[PDB]
Structure formats: C-alpha cells, structure tokens
C-alpha cells in the first residue's frame, strides 16, 4: 500500500510531466529502462548500464556529452 | 507600474501580430504536413515523418535543432 501511494504520486507527475510542454513520447529514456531489463544481460554489465543511464538522465539533452551517452 | 505596463504592451503587440496572421501566418507546419500527406507513402516513414513533425511542433525557434529537424 505504501508503494501504491507512491506510484499514485508519480502518476500525477506523469500527468503534469506530459502536459507541461507537450509529450515527446512514452519518454524514450523509459523505453531504454524497460529494454535494459529485457535483453540478457550479465549482472556487472547491467549495473554499468544502469549507472550510465542515470548519468544520462540528469544532464540536459542536446549536450554533446549526451549524444555520446545515448549512442553507447 | 512600469513592469506591468511593459508586460501588457509586450503581449498586446504580439497578439496583434498573431491576429495580423491568418492561416497561422505563413504556417510552414501545415505546409510540410500537406507536403507529407499528398505523396507516396510507406508506413514506417509515416511514423518517422510524424514524429519529426511533432518535434518541430514543440520548439519553434532559438535552437539550431528546430531548423535541423525541419531540413531533416
């Protein structure tokens, strides 16, 4: 039930996050987060990929740093 | 008083320019939509064309990337 309350909270963040500037998509970073936990993968490289994803998530997009971390 | 005057006159003139605009002004958005919908066309490139159109619909000017997605 505590997770229920939390996931409602972030459902509301879904709503305003969507409508606050238009919706690019299901948030293709969230598509990457889904796909990482589908294909394979070994445990060490899954940890490395999730740290790389969280690093890409909190930087501003369109940076030349970000277009390398997405291609990787 | 001067700040409130500035904001009112600023968006007044911009609304004047919008009204002096019919059919979204020149409105290259609907022009490239008509340039999509009247030729071809396959189906995955339909999705690619509509997502590039939706990336053009959100941001309008200031970044190089808006004109990049226009040309692309």
TrEMBL record, chains A, B:
Induction: By heat shock. It is found in: Cytoplasm. It comes from the Bacteria. Homohexamer. Organized in a ring with a central cavity. Belongs to the peptidase S16 family. ATP-dependent serine protease that mediates the selective degradation of mutant and abnormal proteins as well as certain short-lived regulatory proteins. Required for cellular homeostasis and for survival from DNA damage and developmental changes induced by stress. Degrades polypeptides processively to yield small peptide fragments that are 5 to 10 amino acids long. Binds to DNA in a double-stranded, site-specific manner. This is Lon protease.
């Amino acid at each position: 039930d505590t997770n229920q309350r939390e996931y409602y909270l972030r459902e509301q963040m879904k709503a305003i996050q969507k409508e606050l500037g238009g919706e690019d998509g299901l948030s293709d970073l969230e598509a990457l987060r889904k796909k990482i936990e589908e294909v394979g993968m070994p445990e060490a490289v899954k940890t490395k990929a999730l740290k790389e994803l969280d690093r890409l998530e909190r930087m501003q997009q369109g940076s030349p740093e970000a277009t390398v971390a997405r291609t990787y």
